């Protein structure tokens, strides 16, 4: 078992402006962090009794040499001569006793031994592939939901799938319904799937797991799926948690034959991932979130109940969600009275949140170009033209219809 | 790389290892100190000071050996020496002429808050010896 993320450094800065409250609020936070520094600065200073001038530890120091080799603990023998192999397959039946706890003996778990006499040292090392331990994150990026706006249905769905289960199972318990496990978020690019992922990551009581889809292309043949299997094992070990996979349309796509025979072998990774997700045995208590731009291209085998219990679409904000995003973004910046956000919202269609961020930033940049900190409607009039120029479509369907 | 070792029994380890009664020799013994692998296995051991036994007749015989045998001191054929000398001096003259640029720039530079090239002791010695060879050429013979 384990715990999760430990960021959240007082998310109550609620004036959000140049006010003396936020001067008072943050200086309180400075006071408690300086004291907790001073609490650990003198914590060791008090009670000179430094482990009773030392005892017991000397034995473990002397018994085990300075360097400790590692190996795989093979068949155990009661006489402490369990077989162990080094990295080069140097299998050796060797004694194993010092001031060492002999209860965590299993085939296949890494064990530590002496460089010279190959005797088992003690600390059966408890660590995993660093390629995954790096993925673990305990720093919430930004605000949970306030920033996001307009996706009431989508946020409701994701909440029901993830947050509610690990808050109150009373309903689930009494009704006997197992909460949904897999969720796949899909939609046109920039709709904000990543935004919502970060959002939940900011308010997840459990440890978060982050992975990009194109991360299991290990060069060596085989290996690979072993990576994902170990990842799932680690995630299961560390208490309940959520595993997020971005751009999943890189390891599973229509599961088509080798064709040219290159044997890309990514198909093997996809099959192993699918097996781990749902096949035989039991997954345990682990939630899964998947994000992609194209979902149809995903092979059906990966996408089915028991693996992705929810498919959540993220459409382009039309007017109301569009207005929500627009004024949410503009809030943190000074704007003029004459500005008419609704005017721009109505004027333009097929506009995504990323474009809203870009257009507001560009309007601010243009205003700075004019040397005016305050913005004007004309600033937005120029910005929305500049930003929306790359898009050029429309067949000559201008007369027949 | 030779070295001398001697073991210590594990019965008297309560007593001092090597009772020392001389600072100079003890410090000289420690000057070699102990080798990495030596510490890796220094226990049950204590290196003992070694030294080359006094050597005069052997030393003198070897010294005579070097002059005539271990390096060119036949002293009768001891004296290209006029064939390749021209070419060696040509190389070194060209090289020194080239190297003379760097001191030029160094001097050119102002205060500002690779001139050292020597290359002259070699020429000095070589061509002074060649010129001295005239002594053999004109008197020692004929």
């Amino acid at each position: 078992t384990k715990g999760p993320d430990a960021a959240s450094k007082l998310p109550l800065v609620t004036p959000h402006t140049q006010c003396r409250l936020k001067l008072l609020k943050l200086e309180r936070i400075k006071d408690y962090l300086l004291m907790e520094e001073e609490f650990i600065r003198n914590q060791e200073q008090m009670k000179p009794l430094e482990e009773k001038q030392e005892e017991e530890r000397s034995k473990v120091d002397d018994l085990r040499g300075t360097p400790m080799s590692v190996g795989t603990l093979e068949e155990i023998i009661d006489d402490n001569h369990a077989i162990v192999s080094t990295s080069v397959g140097s299998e050796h039946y060797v004694s194993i006793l010092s001031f060492v706890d002999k209860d965590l003996l299993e085939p296949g778990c890494s064990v530590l031994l002496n460089h010279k006499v190959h005797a088992v040292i003690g600390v059966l090392m408890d660590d995993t592939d660093p390629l995954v331990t790096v993925m673990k994150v305990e720093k919430a990026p930004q605000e949970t939901y306030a920033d996001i706006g307009g996706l009431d249905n989508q946020i409701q769905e994701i909440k029901e799938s993830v947050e509610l289960p690990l808050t109150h199972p009373e309903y689930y318990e009494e009704m006997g319904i197992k909460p949904p496990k897999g969720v796949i978020l899909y939609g046109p690019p920039g709709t904000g799937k990543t935004l919502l992922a970060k959002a939940v990551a900011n308010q997840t009581s459990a440890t978060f797991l982050r992975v990009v889809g194109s991360e299991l292309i290990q060069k060596y043949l085989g290996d690979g799926p072993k990576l994902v299997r170990e990842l799932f094992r680690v995630a299961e070990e560390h208490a309940p948690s959520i595993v997020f996979i971005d751009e999943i349309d890189a390891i599973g796509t229509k599961r088509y034959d080798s064709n040219s025979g290159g044997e890309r072998e990514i198909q093997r990774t996809m099959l192993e991932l699918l097996n781990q997700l749902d096949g035989f045995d039991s997954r345990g208590d682990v939630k899964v979130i998947m994000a992609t731009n194209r979902i149809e291209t995903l092979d059906p085998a990966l996408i089915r109940p028991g693996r992705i219990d929810r498919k959540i679409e993220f459409p382009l904000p039309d007017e109301k969600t569009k207005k929500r995003i627009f004024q949410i973004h503009t809030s943190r910046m000074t704007l003029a009275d004459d500005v008419t956000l609704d005017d721009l919202i109505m004027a333009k269609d097929d506009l995504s949140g990323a474009d809203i961020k870009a257009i507001c930033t560009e309007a601010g940049l243009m205003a700075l170009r004019e040397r005016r900190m305050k913005v004007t409607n004309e600033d937005f009039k120029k910005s929305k033209e500049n930003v929306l120029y790359k898009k050029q479509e429309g067949t000559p369907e201008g007369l027949y219809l | 790389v030779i070295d001398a070792f001697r073991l210590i029994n594990a019965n008297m380890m309560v007593l001092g290892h090597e009772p020392r009664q001389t600072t100079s020799n003890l410090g000289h013994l420690n000057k070699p100190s102990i080798q990495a692998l030596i510490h890796g296995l220094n226990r049950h051991y204590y290196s003992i000071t070694i030294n080359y036994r006094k050597n005069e007749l052997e030393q003198k015989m070897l010294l005579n050996l070097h002059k005539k045998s271990w390096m060119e001191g036949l002293t009768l054929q001891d004296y290209v020496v006029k064939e390749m000398l021209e070419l060696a001096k040509n190389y070194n003259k060209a090289v020194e002429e080239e190297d003379k640029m760097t001191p030029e720039q160094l001097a050119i530079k102002n205060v500002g808050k690779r001139h050292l090239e020597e290359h002259v002791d070699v020429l000095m010695t070589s061509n002074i010896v060649q010129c001295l060879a005239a002594m053999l050429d004109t008197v020692v013979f004929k």
Binding site: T66, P67, H115, M125, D127, P130, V134 | G40
Partner: protein
């Protein structure tokens, strides 16, 4: 002057000592210990010297590791095999700002 030169030549005797291996620190724990994986051979656990504090050690750093006692020697930067070749910050091109077109 030339006593100094002689002393420097004598101090060049340090070349006799064999160099230390190179190992990327897989993970550093407390109590002055770190598990490192040297390239030729599998990973192991080693004790750290006094020159460098533990906190300086982080996962995925290239520690120069003592050859004999398997004790930490130093830390080294630039754990980037061919991509530094693409870094090419050096060799600045011409100051073509003025001679750009209209």
């Amino acid at each position: 002057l030339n006593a100094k030169v002689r002393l420097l030549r004598e101090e060049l005797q340090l070349l006799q000592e064999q160099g230390s291996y190179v190992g990327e620190v897989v993970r550093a724990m407390d109590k002055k210990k770190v598990l490192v994986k040297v390239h030729p051979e599998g990973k192991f656990v080693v004790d750290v010297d006094k020159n460098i504090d533990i906190n300086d050690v982080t996962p995925n750093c290239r520690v120069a590791l003592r050859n004999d006692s398997y004790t930490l020697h130093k830390i080294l930067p630039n754990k980037v095999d061919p991509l530094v070749s693409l870094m090419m910050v050096e060799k600045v091109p011409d100051s073509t700002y003025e001679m750009i077109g209209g």
